[PDB]
Design a binder for these strands. Structure first.
Ligand code: FMN
Ligand code: MG
Length: 308
RNA sequence: GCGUAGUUCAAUUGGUAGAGCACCGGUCAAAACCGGGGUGGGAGUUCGAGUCUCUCCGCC
């Protein structure tokens, strides 16, 4: 059984990847997307998005990390893929599910075939080239054309987020059966994604999709130890350990911090935690109106985890 | 439909805007190399709006 930490732009940066991988057993992390247009991006963009590149593409605890590209033009996906791996990335991921690029490639699977193929030919054969897709644009009727384009490009594996672009993040529309049909169609491995929140949902997803590998995104913020909950049926991280994890986060420094990073990300993480832990509602209200990093850092750090 | 740095572009359910060219500075007029990166106006909601909403303006 494999459990991958999902790419999450504005959420799962290197700091959060560091904190989660310490207390999880994630088999792999994907970075926030590197946006490609018509230009070989400079080295500093890759190091900013993926500081793990300077530790052999690993988090401090040792979990591997993979750079994701979002783009359309094959030549420039290829050249930025070659740079990513040359800098250390363990393979490269192609974004085909972000609402010229992202989910718009799902309208013409030829673009996916052509982009992924150029990336495959640019990256050393044994480093994986993966693709992350949604089921389609507005319906899922072209889902197999999308899947076929990934395989015939020569990609190593396919992550399928089991919704279309229009369905967004609405829970009713999750389609693990569609992922199963893609798995049965393809020779390359298929990784299921969407609405895995705990052990039960991960079991139902693996049972329905037939996938041994899963990827979890928002649930990994809701339950900070979700990989261990999913792999080993362990209980959710107790609330006092969650607060300790947030205290640790306030002590980490973000490079490029324009002043309000922790004001943003403590409140954002608490917003996720608020959907799982009752105690996160009171703590969000305690820090709600704090409008600068020193204050929110002071507020979080002052909590005695021993008395919670 | 779009409007974002001088300009060409980038920016996942709201979390605090970064690349190329141009430009300025440095090493030794220019070159080369190296370093440096403000959301059309206003309003609404929110602790927080490029992002959701209204209004006026501008371009298909
Ligand atoms: C805030 C947020 C940011 C995301 N950013 C990315 C991204 O940069 N690249 C990507 O391929 N998917 C991205 N996704 C999609 C997730 O990887 C994932 O497919 C989706 O959240 C469904 O999984 P889940 O139900 O476990 O959250 C993002 C999702 C969210 C909610
Ligand atoms: Mg966001």
């Amino acid at each position: 059984m494999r459990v991958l930490l999902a790419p999450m732009e504005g959420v799962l940066d290197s700091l959060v990847r560091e904190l989660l991988t310490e207390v999880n057993d994630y088999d792999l992390c994907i970075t926030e997307f590197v946006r490609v247009v018509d230009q070989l991006l400079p080295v500093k963009v890759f190091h900013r998005i993926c500081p793990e590149l300077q530790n052999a593409s690993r988090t401090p605890s040792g979990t591997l990390v993979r750079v994701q590209l979002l783009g359309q033009f094959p030549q420039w996906l290829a050249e930025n893929a070659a740079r990513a791996v040359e800098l250390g990335s363990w393979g490269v991921d192609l974004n085909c599910g972000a609402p010229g690029g992202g989910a718009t490639l799902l309208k013409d699977p030829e673009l996916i075939y052509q982009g992924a193929k150029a990336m495959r030919e640019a990256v050393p054969a044994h480093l994986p080239v993966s693709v992350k897709v949604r089921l389609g644009w507005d319906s899922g009727e072209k889902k197999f054309e999308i899947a076929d384009a990934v395989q015939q490009a020569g990609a190593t594996e396919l992550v399928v987020h089991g919704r279309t672009k229009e369905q967004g993040y609405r829970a009713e529309h999750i389609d693990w059966q569609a992922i199963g049909d893609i798995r049965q169609r393809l020779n390359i491995p298929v990784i299921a994604n969407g609405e895995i929140w705990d052990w039960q949902s991960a079991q139902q997803c693996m049972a329905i999709s037939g996938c041994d590998a899963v990827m979890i995104g928002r649930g990994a913020l809701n339950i900070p130890n979700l990989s261990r909950v999913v792999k080993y049926n362990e209980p959710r991280m107790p609330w006092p350990e969650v607060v300790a994890l947030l205290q640790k986060y306030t002590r980490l420094e973000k490079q490029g911090d324009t002043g309000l990073y922790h004001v943003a990300r403590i409140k954002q993480w608490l917003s996720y935690l608020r959907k799982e832990y009752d105690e996160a509602t009171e703590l969000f209200q305690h820090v709600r109106v704090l409008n600068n990093s020193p204050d929110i850092a002071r507020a979080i750090q002052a909590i005695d985890i021993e008395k919670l």
